[PDB]
Structures are given as C-alpha cells and as structure tokens.
Amino acid sequence: MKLQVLPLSQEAFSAYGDVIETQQRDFFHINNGLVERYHDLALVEILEQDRTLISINRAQPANLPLTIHELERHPLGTQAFIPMKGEVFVVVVALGDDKPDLSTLRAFITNGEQGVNYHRNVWHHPLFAWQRVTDFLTIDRGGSDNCDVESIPEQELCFA
Amino acid sequence: MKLQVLPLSQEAFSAYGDVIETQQRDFFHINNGLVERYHDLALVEILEQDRTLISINRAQPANLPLTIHELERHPLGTQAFIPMKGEVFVVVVALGDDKPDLSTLRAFITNGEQGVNYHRNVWHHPLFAWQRVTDFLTIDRGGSDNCDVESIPEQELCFA
C-alpha cells in the first residue's frame, strides 16, 4: 500500500521515543542567560555501562519513490540520531512485542531542527538520509549485535 | 598572561577526553556501503543508571578578547558537546585531582566538524559559543549539581 509521511512532532512520536529539539521546549537560564539549557530531551537507556557509545553514521540519500518492507528493533538499547548540519530526514516506526504491530506503523519527516531517540525495542527502519549524504551523531550500543529484523508488507512512502 | 589556542586534534586532546569527528577515523561499511559507521568515537561514562540525558545547550558567543579565570569539572560523569550546524568552537582543559594542575592547561579551537567528550573529573571552561549563537547537542548527567568550580590565574586566549 501507501504509507503517508507526516510532520514529526513530540506528541505523535511519544509512543515510540522522543524528539530532540528546542522549539517550545522548557529550558533553564544558565550563566545569567548566557546559555539556555533545553534539558531532558531524551534518556539513553542502554543495558551495559561500557556500551553507551557516541558514533557518527554517514548515510547516503535514498532514491525515490521509496518503498519499505522491513523494520529493525534493538531490545538492549535506545538509539539516537541527530543530523549534524540541519538536514531533514525521515523515520518509520512501529510498536509490537514479537513482531511489528502493523496498526502502529507511522512515518515522519523532520523539519531540519530535530533529532530522534527511539525507545528500546521499538521497531524502525534502518538509517537512511534524505536528498543529500547526511552525518548523524549517534548515541547507541553500536555493533550489529542483538538487532531483530522483521519483514513488513511492502509499501511506498507518500509525501502528500 | 597568555593562553595560546591551537588546532583541536584527537592526540592533543586524548589526556582530557575524546574528539568526535569522522576525518581519518576507522569505520564499518554497513548496508553494502550505504552507511559508514564511524564507531566508538567517545564513551559516555555516567554511573547512575537513569541519568544519561540528551539536551541542547544554546550558548551565546563570548566577547574577545577572551579572558578566563576559572574551570569547572564534573566528578560523576562525562560531558559531550557537539555543535548542531557545523560551528567552530573553543575549549579549555586541564587535568588535576583536587585542583586544576596548571601545567596541564591547554586551549583548542575546532575546525567545525568536531564535537568533544570531556572525561569524568576533567577541568574545562563553562560552555560558551564562538562568533555566533550555537546550539550544542549535549550528553551528560544534566542539572547544576555535583559540579566543582576552581579559579585559575587569569589569562587571555590568543589565536595567533
């Protein structure tokens, strides 16, 4: 079928993780307002101390139209991605215990000022960029270990 | 008295934390090259289990001449800062157990493609931006608790 891609917002994303962004978020005035601290945007929840790792994933832009047929999940850790030069990107997510719960399947496009943190065990699509090669500051467990991949009905993202 | 600011490099910064960047760093080819995973750039070390938080700190640019007279340190966690739109920024670091070991005092300027992760307990300067307001993606314990602050001999950064 067709998967409609919608604007990313914290509320629409909240069942799946957290949106990293400043717009309309509560902050603390630090150093007599020299810094505005937009606090507690996401929580890293990783099983092993020694595996709370910062990396950079440099991702090629997808060809469009874009069709998807599987999602991946990381039971052992959250996974945050924050584009490093203001890039818009696209995310697909689903809840579901053993397998993607297809009724929970949603797709979002960011506004270029947003990163995402997927909660542990939440289904999402493998990382890809939008339009241009994009470096994504990553905070996750790293490796290719304890990643479950499950097929989904083939569908085409629609940016109407 | 004059503190000279030098190019940021991994080898020069290594006693103090890690440089987050891709240039000349080992990576993994993922999804038949579609992603390059620059892995293990920095390790977040926060021992309390619910306190690894992602935030954004939006920092005003300092005025030059830049003069410093104190450093802060966080005994309970690492603190990473990665600029969000490729901004250059300036860092000041020192080692030292109870107090800044003045012989270890260094200043660095980044090339715009770099973030930093201060190791736990490393003295560094309170966050400031360079030239323009800069948003820094932040991974740390958050709050203003368990932060030690220590005067150092006043000094002027020199960018010669």
From Swiss-Prot, chains A, B:
Entry EC no(s): 4.3.2.3
Pathway the protein contributes to: Nitrogen metabolism; (S)-allantoin degradation
Swiss-Prot/TrEMBL cofactor(s): Ni(2+)
GO MF term set: ureidoglycolate hydrolase activity; ureidoglycolate lyase activity
Annotated catalysed reactions: (S)-ureidoglycolate = urea + glyoxylate
Entry superkingdom: Bacteria
Pfam families listed in its UniProt record: Ureidogly_lyase
Alphabetical keyword list: Lyase, Purine metabolism
Keyword ATP-binding: no
Keyword Lyase appears in the UniProt entry: yes
Enzyme class: lyase
UniProt-listed GO biological process terms: allantoin catabolic process; purine nucleobase catabolic process
Gene3D superfamilies: Ureidoglycolate hydrolase
Function: Catalyzes the catabolism of the allantoin degradation intermediate (S)-ureidoglycolate, generating urea and glyoxylate. Involved in the anaerobic utilization of allantoin as sole nitrogen source. Reinforces the induction of genes involved in the degradation of allantoin and glyoxylate by producing glyoxylate.
Family of this protein: Belongs to the ureidoglycolate lyase family.
Subunit description: Homodimer.
Designated name of the protein: Ureidoglycolate lyase
Organism whose genome encodes this protein: Escherichia coli O157:H7
Lineage: Bacteria, Pseudomonadati, Pseudomonadota, Gammaproteobacteria, Enterobacterales
Gene symbol of the encoding locus: allA
